[PDB]
């Protein structure tokens, strides 16, 4: 009975840090995907398990819009079976992933003179994230043989690092807004359908 609220996600006034990535459920609505892709203002738009052209013909269940900001060189990690600080420690897609990754450059918005240090990422963690896990803790990471007991110092690291987006950064060091659309193929009452979708 609704059109899917993609404006609230994509045109959102604020974006989360990748480590505290934001998840919005999308349900009980019709998603015109073509208005996103045919309005191609996106540096990245790759799908997994479906083809971008057949999306308006499909119905899904359990549809989620995850969103965050990362660097250009890290968009590569928002994909199944990747490795690196983002995929291991911040946002991990399953290997069986069905969904679309969408990304665009936000230097115009997320960069400030002298640096924008609001966006953070996790640099250390005792283990890799399971798919779709979310870790927002700030405990000192013990990289050595002595327990930190909440004190930063030698081998005792605050787990989060700022990006520091500056307008003159190289493109791979510039901020990108990312939206991951996660679907599950139809095996239950459909929650979201394309305009020409078959239940």
């Amino acid at each position: 009975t609704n059109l899917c609220p993609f404006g609230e996600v994509f045109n959102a006034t604020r974006f989360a840090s990748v480590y505290a990535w934001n998840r919005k459920r999308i349900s009980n609505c019709v998603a015109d995907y073509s208005v996103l892709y045919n309005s191609a203002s996106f540096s990245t738009f790759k799908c997994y398990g479906v083809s971008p052209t057949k999306l308006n013909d499909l119905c899904f269940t359990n549809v989620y819009a995850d969103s965050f900001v990362i660097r250009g060189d890290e968009v590569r990690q928002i994909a199944p079976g990747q490795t690196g600080k983002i995929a291991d420690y911040n946002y991990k897609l399953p290997d069986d992933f069905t969904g679309c990754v969408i990304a665009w450059n936000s230097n115009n918005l997320d960069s400030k003179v002298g640096g924008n240090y609001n966006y953070l990422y996790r640099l250390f963690r005792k283990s890799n994230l399971k798919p779709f896990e979310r870790d927002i803790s700030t405990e000192i990471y013990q990289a050595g043989s002595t327990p930190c007991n909440g004190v930063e110092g030698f081998n005792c690291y605050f787990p989060l690092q700022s990006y520091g987006f500056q307008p003159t950064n190289g493109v791979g060091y510039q901020p990108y807004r990312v939206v991951v659309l996660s679907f599950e193929l139809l095996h239950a009452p459909a929650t979201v359908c394309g305009p020409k979708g078959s239940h």
Partner: antibody
Amino acid sequence: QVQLVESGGGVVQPGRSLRLSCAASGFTFSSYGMHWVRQAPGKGLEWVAVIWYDGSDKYYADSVKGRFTISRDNSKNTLYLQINSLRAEDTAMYYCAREATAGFDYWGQGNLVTVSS
Amino acid sequence: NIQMTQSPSAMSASVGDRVTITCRARQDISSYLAWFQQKPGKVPKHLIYAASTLLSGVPSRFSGSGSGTEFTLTISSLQPEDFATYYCLQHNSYPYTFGQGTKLEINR
């Protein structure tokens, strides 16, 4: 006053065994990981091994793995380095070092091991 | 083993000179590079960790720089008591590895 006092070195014949001790006092020994470093005469520093504060995780340089074993007794407040099958390359000053948030901030004075017949 | 290489092996400089000592890592070790000072007949002294953080009490003339595989220790105003052998050590991953050392002598 933090003090690391080392013992157990001296002359030893090749192929025999030795056990170096590092007695800690003046701090809570069980709260700190500990490292062994050595220096053959006239040569550079060499990282030997590290043991976790509780005694669990242990790590060794490649050149000493399998022959050296690091250990510790938190009730005796004492760190140990066991060296089997002593060779000429093992002649060195051996130092223990506390790992803290301030850094490698406390070292023992050094214990000389001379592998000689 | 992450191999560490220091250059030069030895050097001299006058009191008040700026001195830089270089450490190269065979693999990327990010910024996890420590510096130590050893005066003949004394225990090593830990001066710097994480490439550029000074330990407490280290005089201001000592400074650290670098990230990745290239690191420098700088003494901005060399003092006679700075005569020593200086060692770098990567603390990126076990086993920790020392470089071979740079002996620093005072020209007078």
